[PDB]
Amino acid sequence: GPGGTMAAEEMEKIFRDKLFHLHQKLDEAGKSAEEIAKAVELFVGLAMRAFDYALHIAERGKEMGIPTLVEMGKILFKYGAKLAAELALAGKSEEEARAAMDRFLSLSDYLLERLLPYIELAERMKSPALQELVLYAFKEGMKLLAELILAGKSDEEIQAKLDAFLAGFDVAFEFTLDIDVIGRELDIPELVEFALEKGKELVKLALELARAGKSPEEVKAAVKARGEELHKEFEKLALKEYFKRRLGL
Amino acid sequence: GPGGTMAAEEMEKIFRDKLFHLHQKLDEAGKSAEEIAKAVELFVGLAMRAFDYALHIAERGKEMGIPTLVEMGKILFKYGAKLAAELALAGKSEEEARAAMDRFLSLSDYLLERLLPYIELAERMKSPALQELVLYAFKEGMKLLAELILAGKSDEEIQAKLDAFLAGFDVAFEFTLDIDVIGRELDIPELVEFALEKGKELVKLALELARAGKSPEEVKAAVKARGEELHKEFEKLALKEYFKRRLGL
Numbered sequence: 286g287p288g289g290t291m292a293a294e295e296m297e298k299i300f301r302d303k304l305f306h307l308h309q310k311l312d313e314a315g316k317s318a319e320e321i322a323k324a325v326e327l328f329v330g331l332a333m334r335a336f337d338y339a340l341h342i343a344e345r346g347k348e349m350g351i352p353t354l355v356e357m358g359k360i361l362f363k364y365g366a367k368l369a370a371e372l373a374l375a376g377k378s379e380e381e382a383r384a385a386m387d388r389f390l391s392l393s394d395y396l397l398e399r400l401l402p403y404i405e406l407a408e409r410m411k412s413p414a415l416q417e418l419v420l421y422a423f424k425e426g427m428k429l430l431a432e433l434i435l436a437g438k439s440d441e442e443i444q445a446k447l448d449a450f451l452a453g454f455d456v457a458f459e460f461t462l463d464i465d466v467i468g469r470e471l472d473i474p475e476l477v478e479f480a481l482e483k484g485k486e487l488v489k490l491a492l493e494l495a496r497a498g499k500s501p502e503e504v505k506a507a508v509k510a511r512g513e514e515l516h517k518e519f520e521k522l523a524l525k526e527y528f529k530r531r532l533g534l
Numbered sequence: 535g536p537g538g539t540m541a542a543e544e545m546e547k548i549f550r551d552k553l554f555h556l557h558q559k560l561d562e563a564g565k566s567a568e569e570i571a572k573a574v575e576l577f578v579g580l581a582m583r584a585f586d587y588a589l590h591i592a593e594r595g596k597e598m599g600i601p602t603l604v605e606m607g608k609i610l611f612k613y614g615a616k617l618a619a620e621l622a623l624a625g626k627s628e629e630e631a632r633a634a635m636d637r638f639l640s641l642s643d644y645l646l647e648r649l650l651p652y653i654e655l656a657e658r659m660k661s662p663a664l665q666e667l668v669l670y671a672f673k674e675g676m677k678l679l680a681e682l683i684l685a686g687k688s689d690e691e692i693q694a695k696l697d698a699f700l701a702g703f704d705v706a707f708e709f710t711l712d713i714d715v716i717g718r719e720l721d722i723p724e725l726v727e728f729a730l731e732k733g734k735e736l737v738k739l740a741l742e743l744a745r746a747g748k749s750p751e752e753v754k755a756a757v758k759a760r761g762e763e764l765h766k767e768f769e770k771l772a773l774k775e776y777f778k779r780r781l782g783l
């Protein structure tokens with residue numbers, strides 16, 4: 286509506302879209318009118334709490350000097366609205382839905398606290414690629430957290446999976462930072478693009494490993510091996526680009 | 535009647551309506567002319583005492599700065615006239631009916647004295663919702679008292695039911711006031727309407743518990759639990775309305 290925050294308008298658009306598509310899905314599923322009304326009110330109730338939490342996070346990011354936290358808040362609201370829509374569609378009771386939303390918010394806070402130092406490190410070196418990698422990691426962690434909360438998992442298994450995912454993300458971040466520093470210093474955008482793409486690949490691999498239930502050590506080892514292979518590919522690409530630049534090509 | 539106070543005209547209208555419908559009921563019942571005459575004279579005799587007592591209460595309220603007492607006197611007269619009509623219809627003699635009317639008046643005074651501090655507290659904070667809540671509680675107490683007097687109950691059980699009802703009304707009043715203060719301060723009429731409706735619901739629940747014979751502690755516990763549920767509902771509604779206002783909707 287009129288007179289709002291730049292971050293709040295996007296969240297309002299997301300909420301309206303999710304409500305419209307939830308009504309569409311309820312109509313497709315063929316439910317009674319009272320069931321549809323119950324699902325709609327439950328979804329609105331949960332989405333308001335998710336909206337409040339995400340708006341608080343975005344405002345906290347705005348008050349500091351961290352523009353990344355605004356995007357993290359928007360991502361958090363998007364996936365909280367998705368979780369609320371699925372909870373309403375599944376026909377869960379009000380108390381169970383509220384408890385699930387509370388657990389989701391708490392574990393998202395956990396992931397945010399674990400990811401903040403990486404945001405500080407990325408913003409210290411003024412690396413857009415590192416900030417993009419952190420945002421991608423937060424998005425993947427939000428996906429995994431929402432799926433696990435939907436599946437009905439305890440707060441310990443989810444925390445262990447998040448720990449394994451962060452163990453993989455540490456290696457992915459180190460790989461991306463290494464490549465990106467030399468890509469920026471030598472003034473070769475192809476190296477930066479390679480860094481971002483292969484860091485995203487490493488983050489995807491780490492998330493897939495964490496979902497399978499591996500310990501953080503196994504995730505670290507496998508992400509390290511994949512990073513070594515991608516580092517060999519980077520060596521080839523860097524040699525090619527440097528010789529393109531040196532010869533005037 | 536040409537001339538008289540504002541509160542007296544409404545009471546006269548109530549008396550005429552009750553007399554007319556009592557005559558209709560007597561005609562429908564198929565009673566002798568002498569029985570109809572004795573019922574009419576008994577009803578008039580009891581209604582005159584009820585009218586005098588309620589008018590005295592109304593003038594007492596009018597002398598001070600308490601407009602609520604005028605409405606409470608009108609309610610007292612209405613229910614006293616109803617009780618007189620039932621006594622006349624039941625064929626009770628001139629002595630048992632008079633004793634029942636006297637007991638009803640004494641217990642109405644008891645309820646009035648117990649409800650006066652809540653009237654003072656409501657008028658101190660200038661809250662129309664709390665005034666309506668006190669009026670509704672007085673009406674429910676009048677209903678219960680008239681029913682118990684007609685059923686032929688001693689002054690001990692009636693009094694115990696009265697304190698049980700007042701124990702429930704204390705929690706109802708606290709809940710309504712807690713919601714109403716924040717609803718008025720934030721300027722959201724929906725919150726005040728919700729407060730009034732849920733306070734009325736809590737008063738109804740307290741009256742139902744008192745009628746069944748539950749002790750005041752059980753009534754207090756049940757009303758407190760229902761208040762917790764309605765408080766969760768209020769939290770949801772307040773969040774929704776606050777986000778409607780903040781986004782310009």
Ligand SMILES: [Zn+2]
Binds near residue numbers: 337338
């Ligand atoms: Zn808030």
Ligand SMILES: [Zn+2]
Binds near residue numbers: 464
């Ligand atoms: Zn290197």
Ligand SMILES: [Zn+2]
Binds near residue numbers: 712713765
């Ligand atoms: Zn409250």
